[PDB]
Amino acid sequence: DGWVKVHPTPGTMLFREILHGQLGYTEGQGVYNVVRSSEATTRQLQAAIFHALLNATTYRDLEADWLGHVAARGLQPQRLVRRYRNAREADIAGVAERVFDTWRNTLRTTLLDFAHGLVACFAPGGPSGPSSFPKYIDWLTCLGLVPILRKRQEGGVTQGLRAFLKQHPLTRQLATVAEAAERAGPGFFELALAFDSTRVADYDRVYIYYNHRRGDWLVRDPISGQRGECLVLWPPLWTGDRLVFDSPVQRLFPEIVACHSLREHAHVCRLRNTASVKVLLGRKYDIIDVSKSMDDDTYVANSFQHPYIPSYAQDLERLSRLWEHELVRCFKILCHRNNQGQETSISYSSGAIAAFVAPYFESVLRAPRVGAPITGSDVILGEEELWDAVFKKTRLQTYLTDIAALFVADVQHA
Amino acid sequence: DGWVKVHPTPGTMLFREILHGQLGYTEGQGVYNVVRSSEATTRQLQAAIFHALLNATTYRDLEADWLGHVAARGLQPQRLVRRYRNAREADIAGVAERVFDTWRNTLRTTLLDFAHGLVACFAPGGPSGPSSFPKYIDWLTCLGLVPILRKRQEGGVTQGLRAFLKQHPLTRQLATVAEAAERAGPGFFELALAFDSTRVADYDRVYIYYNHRRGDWLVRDPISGQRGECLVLWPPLWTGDRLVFDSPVQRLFPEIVACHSLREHAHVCRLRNTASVKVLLGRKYDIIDVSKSMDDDTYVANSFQHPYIPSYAQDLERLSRLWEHELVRCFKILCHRNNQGQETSISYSSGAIAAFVAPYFESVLRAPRVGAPITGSDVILGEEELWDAVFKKTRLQTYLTDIAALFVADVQHA
Amino acid sequence: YDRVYIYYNHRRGDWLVRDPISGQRGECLVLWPPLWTGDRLVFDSPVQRLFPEIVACHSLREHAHVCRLRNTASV
């Protein structure tokens, strides 16, 4: 009733084949490899987890832990001052600030270890398997659509979380991390459930049907008999006779076809010209041409030779430049070049992550709030740098300084 | 029932051949050699072992050892101050600082020697043989798969560890070293067991089967009859007739074939052209072309000479550049180049380790914990620099400074 | 180099090195392993990689010399 088949057509198969370089290849196309990188997704995962865990810190809990450690070490400031029998403010101030600094950086290391354990638990299920990011990105590149199949289930990620959190010894030693983990735990459980639920359709096993009268989609798995959903970022066009996509491969398609045809014709012409001497036969290493087959009351009046051979270097170079420029502009990639003109590194710009990573989470993953998205510089840096940067600004440092200021000032003012 | 062979087909054998330069070779392909480097894995082992050793330190045990050394040297602050008979606190402060600093660097030398022995114990078995890193890399490059055969058994690595730890007299001298080694012992045994258990399949024997109807793999050893696991990083695609892999060699395949065919055609055309003078005969150093063989009731009309010779400089240069660019972008390698654009060294970037080294440990080797991944700068630096860097920021330095300041206060008030 | 004898087996994958004259049995160590492709063996040494190009270059030089010698005549 107005429906038409879309995906199993050979056109999309040819698109995917040209993505793998089945015909033609240029170094400009090589920039596509960084477009499939999962660095941004992992950065977003760890930043969101860091924000979630650290915002659960309690001022009272950390004050209780600090006073418990103080009692355990017996470092009562009045007792230390009386034992030292001096009014040297600088000495006791240095001692107190150093002790608080050692407590703060041991807390930092413990929190870093626990967060690293959590993010390592979450890491494997992101890139490979369910919600595979490269599959989403090459779906958007090939056609501009992201088919999805949803099903509520318990997955291996939840099993890993369960096998991780309970037996972790850090809950027994540090109380504050225990309360922080337990109060936010259902959020991580829901995140794991969302990870399991979302499955991205495999390219060669999914069928897409579109109806043009009303403009609605239908996606189903021929083998599993499961109905899914269709998500579109930039919609296609329906001319009435053929559905015309608007993906970058669609735009690039005619030029690659022309270049490949030219290269094939050049090869065919080159193969013919292997001969050295040619002759002709007519009525009154070597190749003989015989016109006697078609001689019928005829006679040769003249003959000509023109050994053409096509050239294709500039066309390949232009195709490489076009590939590079299109892939740079479409995905808003960021390029770094030095004074002499040498390329140094390729990284995602802030626009790229804001335009692709965030909608991925909000629609393909259906994940809850992810907090403030990272900046373009953060993805370049390392995990420890991101951890320190987020730790400095956020809530925990304010409580830490709040404790430190009064704890220090009390002993010297006394 | 839907199964089909994957590896024994001549395509993968041709891929492995083309890596070894069986056909064609260019300067760009040479950058593959630095990819197979084992420096990153060894640096990761060093960092992991250093972290696993240092965290086992005990503040009480370190204090006990320091006070025992002080008592052995008779460095009682009260007695030494009474002997000096002067009010110069600077002298006693400097003496205490120097003595504790020599204790510091003696502890550091002992720790680094023991750690170097331990890492040397794990050094040979890791990157080569069982769980050999270059085989993992060239499996990823050839196909995108990493066949694995697993078996739980004791290995020579554990034998070396056993020959090391209890035969090391360092435990009898320093209490802290013995206590830390005893605490961290089981983890190293688990690491050795993980090293021995994992075996990477060899290219010439193992067989892998695929089935698209349900998307499953089957890997087995034809001779030993052992069944294993099939790991995939970037999956392939099934287009009915064939299975187009998504490895870099697969992308590069058509261009190399075209270049090699052109070189062969150029050679065969060049060999023919060695003649200087050529003549032809017909019915009424030297080469004679007898057209009389087919000259029957036929008569010549004209003759031609077009001595073509193909050239291949441009294709070779482009292939070299394409090889270099593809290998640089695919594995996220990093280059260092100076003012005039000439390179000086090749390094293993942070993205490279984060995308290859870590999943290798987590899946191929099934390591329990690797700690915080190193930065891209650490692989450049030497072992001693890495040890010194990891020593400074960690718990043992905190304990060391805590002891130092309290001892300085005690000696200055004494 | 010119004395030692090296034997290899493909089904089990083991080596055997012995001195033909002294009769002494030794030990075989490998850094990067070779490859077994049926009725052939392919090493992975740098010279092995460089081999297919040097042969072509030497053949080209030989053919150039052969052609040069012929053209010494004037008429």
Residue numbers in the entry:
A (entry chain d), B (entry chain c): 24 to 27, 29 to 308, 494 to 623
C (entry chain a): 227 to 301
Reported in the publication:
A unique portal vertex exists at a 12th I5 vertex through which the genome is translocated during assembly. Here, portal proteins assemble into a dodecameric basket-like structure that is thought to seed the assembly of scaffolding proteins, in turn driving the formation of spherical procapsids composed of MCP, SCP, and triplexes. A separate protein complex, the terminase, associates with the dodecameric portal and initiates genome packaging and the concurrent autoproteolytic cleavage of the scaffold.
To improve the resolution of the portal baskets, we carried out separate sub-particle reconstructions and refined them while imposing C12 symmetry, leading to portal basket structures at resolutions of 3.6, 3.5, and 3.7 Å for the A-, B-, and C-capsids, respectively. However, our D-capsid portal structures have the same portal basket position as C-capsids despite being mostly devoid of genome. These observations together suggest that genome pressure alone does not determine portal basket height, and the elevated portal position observed in C- and D-capsids may instead be an irreversible step during capsid maturation. D-capsid portals had 4 Å variability in height, but otherwise resembled C-capsid portals. These findings reveal distinct patterns of portal basket variability, with A- and B-capsids exhibiting greater positional and rotational flexibility compared to the more constrained movement observed in C- and D-capsids. The C12 reconstruction of both A- and B-capsid portal baskets revealed a small hook-like density with large aromatic side chains and sharp turns wedged into a hydrophobic pocket between the crown domains of each portal monomer.
